Amino acid sequence: STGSATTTPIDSLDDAYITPVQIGTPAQTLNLDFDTGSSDLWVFSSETTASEVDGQTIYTPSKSTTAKLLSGATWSISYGDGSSSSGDVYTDTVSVGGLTVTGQAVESAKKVSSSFTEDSTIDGLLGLAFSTLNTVSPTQQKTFFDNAKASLDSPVFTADLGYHAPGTYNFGFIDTTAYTGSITYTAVSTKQGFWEWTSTGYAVGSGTFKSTSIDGIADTGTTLLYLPATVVSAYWAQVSGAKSSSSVGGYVFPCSATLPSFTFGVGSARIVIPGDYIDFGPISTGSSSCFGGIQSSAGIGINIFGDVALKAAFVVFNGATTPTLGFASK
Numbered sequence: 001s002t003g004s005a006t007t008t009p010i011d012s013l014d015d016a017y018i019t020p021v022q023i024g025t026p027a028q029t030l031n032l033d034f035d036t037g038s039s040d041l042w043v044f045s046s047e048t049t050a051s052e053v054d055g056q057t058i059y060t061p062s063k064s065t066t067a068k069l070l071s072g073a074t075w076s077i078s079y080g081d082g083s084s085s086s087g088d089v090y091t092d093t094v095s096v097g098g099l100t101v102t103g104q105a106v107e108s109a110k111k112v113s114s115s116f117t118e119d120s121t122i123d124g125l126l127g128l129a130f131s132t133l134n135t136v137s138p139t140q141q142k143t144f145f146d147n148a149k150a151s152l153d154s155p156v157f158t159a160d161l162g163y164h165a166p167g168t169y170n171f172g173f174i175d176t177t178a179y180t181g182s183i184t185y186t187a188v189s190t191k192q193g194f195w196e197w198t199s200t201g202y203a204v205g206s207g208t209f210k211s212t213s214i215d216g217i218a219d220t221g222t223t224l225l226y227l228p229a230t231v232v233s234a235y236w237a238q239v240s241g242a243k244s245s246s247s248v249g250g251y252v253f254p255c256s257a258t259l260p261s262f263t264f265g266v267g268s269a270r271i272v273i274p275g276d277y278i279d280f281g282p283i284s285t286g287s288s289s290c291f292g293g294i295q296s297s298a299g300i301g302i303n304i305f306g307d308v309a310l311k312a313a314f315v316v317f318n319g320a321t322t323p324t325l326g327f328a329s330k
Contacts (some may be wrong), residue, residue, distance in 0.1 A: 273308060
């Protein structure tokens with residue numbers, strides 16, 4: 001089997017991407033944030049505290065003839081940005097882009113933190129990291145991809161995120177018309193539960209490529225590119241007036257600037273992030289200070305190849321027995 005679904009930016013900055021997902025019978029379509037940095041499929045629901053729902057579409061398990069409570073199961077998750085959610089668990093039929101999984105754990109939120117409530121466009125998350133990170137207790141549950149894998153034509157999914165435009169998540173096949181040149185694959189470590197890999201270096205603008213190993217994760221659920229302070233300083237030093245602001249929370253730059261590109265290495269290959277992808281706009285409405293799309297990871301503990309980086313590539317998440325990542329230009 002295969003599936004193919006369009007993913008759409010939630011706003012004009014590409015802060016996140018939503019993908020429609022069919023849950024239950026008859027189908028309830030919710031728009032979920034596909035997140036290769038986590039491993040829970042959770043939704044706003046008829047069980048969510050009413051004051052914490054503000055415009056989201058909810059899953060109502062009592063209206064689904066295929067829903068079943070997973071007795072005793074609870075979940076609770078905290079994300080790197082400080083947001084969180086928790087609740088109980090149903091199994092139900094879940095379909096993405098024509099690919100159907102029966103018996104998928106659908107984690108129904110009883111509580112969500114304010115950042116979720118305040119984002120009316122995201123009805124939940126669909127985790128695509130390794131199932132060892134799933135938070136369901138006392139019996140850990142599998143991701144949608146793990147449940148689908150055996151049925152797929154090939155045990156892969158691909159992320160093709162757009163710049164200020166829709167893109168595609170495909171399951172079970174590699175669309176050879178969706179990228180240019182060849183795909184370069186690179187080894188993955190699953191030791192932390194992430195799609196963790198080692199970039200071979202970077203260049204700033206037209207500068208020389210610096211060969212250096214940068215371990216990090218491919219995370220579609222993180223907006224920006226978080227890299228070591230040395231690398232980030234080298235980038236922003238090429239932008240007149242750019243500076244790191246503790247009060248704002250990262251590097252800012254004059255909105256009048258033209259940003260240089262940023263290149264990252266994948267083996268001997270190179271992925272070029274255009275400068276315009278690194279502009280996240282005014283820090284507040286009407287400001288002439290703009291927020292940078294490349295930020296330091298020094299306070300995170302891990303480097304993160306988020307959407308800024310991934311949307312410059314066609315990315316293969318290869319879930320074979322020995323997982324790998326593939327990157328192509330597009």
